[PDB]
Amino acid sequence: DTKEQRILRYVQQNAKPGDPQSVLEAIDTYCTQKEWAMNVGDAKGQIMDAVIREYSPSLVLELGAYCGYSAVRMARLLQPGARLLTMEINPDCAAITQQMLNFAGLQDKVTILNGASQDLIPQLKKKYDVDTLDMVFLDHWKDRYLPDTLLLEKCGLLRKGTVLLADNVIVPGTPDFLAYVRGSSSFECTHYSSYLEYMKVVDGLEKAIYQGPS
Ligand SMILES: Cc1cc(C(=O)N2CCN(C)CC2)sc1-c1cc(O)c2nc[nH]c(=O)c2c1
Ligand SMILES: Nc1ncnc2c1ncn2[C@@H]1O[C@H](CSCC[C@H](N)C(=O)O)[C@@H](O)[C@H]1O
Numbered sequence: 001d002t003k004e005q006r007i008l009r010y011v012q013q014n015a016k017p018g019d020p021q022s023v024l025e026a027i028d029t030y031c032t033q034k035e036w037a038m039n040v041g042d043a044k045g046q047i048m049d050a051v052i053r054e055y056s057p058s059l060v061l062e063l064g065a066y067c068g069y070s071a072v073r074m075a076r077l078l079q080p081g082a083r084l085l086t087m088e089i090n091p092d093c094a095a096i097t098q099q100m101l102n103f104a105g106l107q108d109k110v111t112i113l114n115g116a117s118q119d120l121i122p123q124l125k126k127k128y129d130v131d132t133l134d135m136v137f138l139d140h141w142k143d144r145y146l147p148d149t150l151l152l153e154k155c156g157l158l159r160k161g162t163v164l165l166a167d168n169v170i171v172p173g174t175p176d177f178l179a180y181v182r183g184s185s186s187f188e189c190t191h192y193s194s195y196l197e198y199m200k201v202v203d204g205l206e207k208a209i210y211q212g213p214s
């Protein structure tokens with residue numbers, strides 16, 4: 001028995017199959033009541049929703065799936081024929097995410113890439129026929145926000161207007177990523193102040209929109 005297995009079991013036992021919203025509510029509730037977990041959460045999640053609806057991205061890359069929360073959260077808002085790719089380094093997590101998605105009936109929108117973002121990113125074009133990404137959600141590991149951003153730019157995966165949206169720019173924090181995007185002419189940055197999931201510690205998401213080469 002693992003915490004993530006408990007979360008998936010709670011969903012299967014409580015959420016309406018095929019209804020993404022009830023799946024989100026089931027997760028939020030269990031982690032609000034029984035056991036904190038690092039899902040992006042409902043407060044930050046509403047900000048994500050608002051940004052998704054603005055940009056209506058056809059191709060979203062997620063870094064870090066975990067239990068599938070934000071994948072569910074995002075894919076439920078995708079237009080028909082839009083796809084989300086999510087990268088997960090931990091097999092136990094990737095398979096729980098696959099199940100969470102299957103239960104919400106979003107499996108056909110979502111493709112889980114198993115492995116480390118740094119290894120998978122260079123393989124997107126060949127193995128998944130990706131041209132450029134419309135949106136990227138950074139939410140794996142703070143140390144990799146900056147390295148992986150440079151990777152994406154280098155692998156030609158960013159176009160003018162690509163939206164990078166980063167979670168935890170305040171807690172646990174991503175100082176170097178923040179300083180880089182805020183300092184670079186290649187990004188237009190906006191900060192959304194929210195709260196750490198299932199808590200009232202202050203956190204935020206950063207939107208950094210790629211402007212193209214300088
Ligand atoms: C693991 C962890 C602990 C945090 C914290 O301050 N505390 C936790 C424990 N509780 C009890 C107090 C407060 S915040 C956080 C966290 C939150 C995310 O949203 C993350 N997203 C992606 N990848 C991460 O590593 C990630 C970690
Ligand atoms: N370098 C990396 N490449 C791919 N996945 C990574 C990674 N570093 C950490 N991860 C994974 O990213 C997850 C961070 S928590 C992700 C939560 C998710 N975005 C949500 O809001 O629901 C963890 O499951 C961790 O195993």
Ligand SMILES: [Mg+2]
Nearest residue numbers: 040139167168
């Ligand atoms: Mg997070």
